[PDB]
Design a protein around this ligand. Structure first.
Ligand SMILES: CNC(=S)Nc1ccc(F)cc1F
Length: 209
């Protein structure tokens, strides 16, 4: 049972701008997704300060980076607060309509795509390097869901029958054919050291057979 939704016009416009603008500094997608994971981890940590049972779904607070060259995927896993179905549909828990408006206003006032995270829509920088993005998520107050989009104006949401995650979010980047440098260990390490050196959660880069 799969539900298909239209993006709001402004988000479709943001995604087409990210996909079609010539902009060589694509590596910032990873900084933006790690920053989103850190924000999600901060949220569940804050809730746990007054209600420890919020961590019954998992006490460890971390970020894993999992490249898979066979599948041509880079997955960013975190054990943060996750998202409900309603959050997923409402632009993955962002204020993306007003964030896109602010981002566009900034781009015409000198900004570049790398500043996208300052406008709360850094998730969509995934489409700098991915032809398709799958988001698997589990929030304490809802069931596990999979969101997916290859852009083109629509996204899908379905109940996820995959491996249970406990709590958190997994962003699966199905990389464009010419963006496979982001599966190479040395390239991912370089990006994490350059842009994510002060993130307050352990970031583990998995290796492959
Ligand atoms: C009321 N909001 C304002 S003033 N926002 C705003 C956003 C991006 C800019 F580049 C300039 C801006 F003024």
């Amino acid at each position: 049972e799969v539900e298909t939704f239209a993006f709001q016009a402004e988000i479709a416009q943001l995604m087409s701008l990210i996909i079609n603008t010539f902009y060589s500094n694509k590596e910032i997608f990873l900084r933006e997704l790690i920053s989103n994971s850190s924000d999600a981890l901060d949220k569940i940590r804050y809730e746990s300060l007054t209600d420890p049972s919020k961590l019954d779904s998992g006490k460890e607070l971390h970020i894993n980076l999992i490249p898979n060259k066979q599948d041509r995927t880079l997955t960013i896993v975190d054990t943060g607060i996750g998202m409900t179905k309603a959050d997923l549909i409402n632009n993955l828990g962002t204020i993306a309509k007003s964030g896109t408006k602010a981002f566009m206003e900034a781009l015409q006032a000198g900004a570049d795509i790398s500043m996208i995270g300052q406008f709360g829509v850094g998730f969509y920088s995934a489409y700098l390097v991915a032809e398709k993005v799958t988001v698997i998520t589990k929030h304490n107050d809802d069931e596990q869901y999979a969101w997916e989009s290859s852009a083109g104006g629509s996204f899908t949401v379905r109940t996820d029958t995959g491996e249970p995650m406990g709590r958190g979010t997994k962003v699966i980047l199905h990389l464009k054919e010419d963006q496979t440098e982001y599966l190479e260990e040395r390239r991912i390490k370089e990006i994490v050291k350059k842009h994510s050196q002060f993130i307050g959660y352990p970031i583990t880069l998995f290796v492959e057979k």
